[model samples]
Target: QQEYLNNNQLDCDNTHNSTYGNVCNSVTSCQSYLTFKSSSPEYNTPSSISYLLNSTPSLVAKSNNITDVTPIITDTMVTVPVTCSCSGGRYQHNATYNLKKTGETYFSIANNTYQSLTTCQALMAQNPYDAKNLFAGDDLHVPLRCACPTKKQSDAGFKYLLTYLVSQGESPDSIAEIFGVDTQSVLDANELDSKSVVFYFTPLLVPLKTEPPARLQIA
Candidate 1:
C-alpha cells in the first residue's frame, strides 16, 4: 500500500493508448512487458494505478507520460490482455515510488505496507544499489500486497499444506504449535533451511495436522 503522489493534470484530452502481446501501456510503450495505459484520466493517481495493477500482475504502471500525453481523448479504447495469475500461482503488482529520504531500509517499506521485508528485497534486487544507498527522489518499484496460492490437500496421513502469514516474533516452533504440528514439519513445508529467519508479514507454508486423535474408551 505505497503512496503514489504525482503532481499532474487528470484531464484525458491528451491520451494515447496502444496494446500488444504483453506490452506495457504506461507512460512509455513496451514491446513485451506488463501492460498499463501510459495515458489515461487516472494515470497519475497512485491509488488508482495500484488498484488497476493489483487487479492483475501482467499489467505494469509506469510513471512516464502520465502528465505529458496527447491523443485528443479519442473514442477508441485499447484492449489489454488480462492474466489471472503469474508463475507459481501468485498474484503480484508493483507501483513506482520516489525515495523520500536516505537510509530507508527495505524492512521499513515492508512494515509500512504490511508486507514482508523479503518481498521488498526481491523488488529492490532488480536494481544495482542497496536500499540504504538509494538517493532521494529516485524511483523505487515496490511490490504491493500479494495473495498466496490456495492450500492443497496432502496425501500423507493427517497432514495438509496450509498458508500462514508471519507475524512479529513468530518462529517455526511457534507457528507449528498453533497447528499442533512439529517445528521441523513447518520448516520442511516452506522449504526453508533450518534456523533461517522468517521475515514479518511474509507468507509461509505450514504442514498442518487436520485429523483428530483416536479416542480411548474405558469399559
Candidate 2:
C-alpha cells in the first residue's frame, strides 16, 4: 500500500522588485520509517528493512501490513515482511569506523569505497577535527548507506553515483578527466547537449566505477 501526501505551496511573487519575503504556508516535507518483525510464514527468515529516497531510490524494502509504507530493495530472498513508501528526501544511515592506519584521508577512503568525499565530509561535519590530526584510535562517523528516488537503476550501468558541484570555469571534459571517465559518457549520462553550459554550483551526476565494471573498457 502507498499514500501520497499533499504538496505544500510556496508563496513567492513573480515581480523582480518584490520586497515581500517568500514563505510556505505549511511545510509537509516529512517521512516516517519503521521496522517490524515478519509474521507471515513466507518471510519467517532473518530480515530487515531499508529505504532510499532521492531523485532516484537505490534501495527499498517491502512493507509488512503497515499500510502506506514504501518498498526498497534488499538482498535476502527468504520469505518475510515486505510494502514501501518513499518521497524526495535523504536516508540517514550512519556507521562508525575506527582509524586503523596512517595517511588515510577522506579522498582515499571514498576512492576505495562507494562514498564520495563530499558525503564523507557531511558525515564528519558535526564531529569537528582536522584530518591531519587523525590517529589510529580516532573514531569517525561514516556514511555507508543511502536511498534515492528516481530511475531505480542507472542507464549507464553504475554501482555508485556522486553529485558533484560544478565550479567556475569547469567543463565536462575537465570533470571527466578528474574522475577518469570519457567526456561524452558524462554528457550522455546527464543528457546534456554538446553546447550545453554547466553553470557554477550546478550539481552533476558522476557515475563512478563499480566493484565489477558493468561493461568492457575501451582503453
Candidate 3:
C-alpha cells in the first residue's frame, strides 16, 4: 500500500501518454507515469491553442489522501489531473490523482499505508512449490520463472538452483550422478571455485507484488 498527500493530478490527454507497455491493457498507447504535483489538470479543449486546457489556481489544499485503486470485474477507476497555485498565488504546479471509487475504503493520507504480510500456517505439503526450501544437493527449489542463459538470468539461475539443490539434500556426488553433469558444473554456475566447500542460497522474486505504478500529471 502507498500513501499520498492530495497535491497531484493524473494527466490523461491521449497525446500526453507514454510509450511504455501497459501490463493491464497490454497496449502501447495506454500507459502513463506518475507525478507528485497534484493540482493542475489538463484536458483536450478545442479553445486552447494545443487543444488542451488546465485548471485555474485556488484548487490546492495541504490535506493528504490515498486512493485505493484495486481493479474489479467492472468499472474503471478515474483520475483527476490538476494544476495548483500557492495560497498567496506565488508558485504554481500540477499533479495527477485517482478519484474515489465505489467500495473503496480510504483512510487519511497523513499516516503512510501499512500492509501485513501473509502468515505461514502449514508446513510444506503436496504442492512442492508452496513453501520454498533451499538445498545444495537433492532438494533444490526450481526457479519459478524460467532461467534464460543470458547475463541477466545467470545470477538468478545460480541463486534459485543453489537453494533448490540444498533443500533436496543431494550431495555433490549424488547430484552429479542424477543430473549427469559433473559436480564442477554446478560449482561453476554458482561461482564457487574449487576451494569453497559450502554455498549460500537466498530467495528473490517471490510471488508477492508491489503497489501499482501511479499515472502522470501535466499542466
Candidate 4:
C-alpha cells in the first residue's frame, strides 16, 4: 500500500499560461507528497510526470549521449525524433520512452476486470489520466485526475500567440509577412482573439497499455 498525497489544491482552470497559475487545477505542491509510510488504498499515489528541456541524469537526459552509455530499458520500441543543438551544430535523436509501469498493483478495475475496453473506460471514468506512473523534477508534470468528462477547448491566437507561435515555432515578423498583416496588428489580434486566431486541439488524450488478445481457434 502506497501513501497518497492530497492534490486538490490543483484547480481545473486552463485560462492561465502555466497550469500552475490556474486555481482549482488538478495538482499539488512540492510540500505535499506520498511517503512510503502512508501507502494505502485510500492514499494512492497519483502518478504524474512532465516533459520539458532538462539537464538532469534521467532517461530523458541520458538519451543525449551516444558513445559510452547503456539505456535503462533495453526492449526498444519505436523511436521519436527530436532536434538537439550542440556547440558545433544540430543533431537528431529518439525521445520515446518504452517504459511502462512495472506491475499492476495500480490498474484500472472495471467490470471486475473482465473486459479491456470496460476496464479502460472505467479507468478513464475514475481518472481521465493516471499519474501514479509519473514523478516530480520532470517537465510539464501537471497533476491531472479523472479528466473532465466535458472540457472546453480554447484555441485561437492567444493560445500560442506570443509564447508558442512567435517565440518557439515561428517568428512574429515572418508570420506577419506571410499573412500580409503588420506585426503589431498580429500581436493585437492574437491578444484579443487567441481562440479564434490559432488552432485548437483534441484535449482528451488517453494512454492505454493492453496487448490485443490472440485470435481464437475452433476445431
- What is residue 175's positional error in candidate 2, in angstroms? 17
Give the number of the best model, judged by TM-score.
1
**Which regions of candidate 1 fall more than 4 Å away from where they truly are?**
1-103, 110-115, 119-121, 127-133, 144-169, 177-185, 192-203, 207-219
- TM-score for all predictions? 0.34, 0.31, 0.20, 0.19
Number of the candidate with higher TM-score, 3 or 4: 3
Window of ten residues with lowest summed lDDT in model 2: 1-10
In the range 91-203, model 4's lDDT, one tens digit per residue, is 11112122233433112221111111012222222333353553323222112211101111112211111111111234334445543445554444223223333321101
Tell me the lDDT of candidate 3: 0.21
Residue 183 in candidate 4, Cα distance off native in Å:
1.3
Q: Which regions of candidate 2 are displaced past 4 Å?
A: 1-92, 113-120, 144-147, 150-219
Which of candidates 1 and 3 is the stronger one according to lDDT? 1
User: What are the lDDT figures for the candidates, one per model?
Assistant: 0.38, 0.35, 0.21, 0.21
Instruction: Quote model 3's TM-score.
Output: 0.20
Error of 3 at 25 (Å): 29
Over 4 Å off in model 3, which ranges? 1-146, 151-163, 199-219
The best-first sequence of candidates by lDDT reads 1, 2, 4, 3
TM-score ranking of the models: 1, 2, 3, 4
Count of backbone collisions within predicted model 1 = 6
Cα lDDT of model 3 by residue, 69-98, tens digit: 222111111122232222111111222122
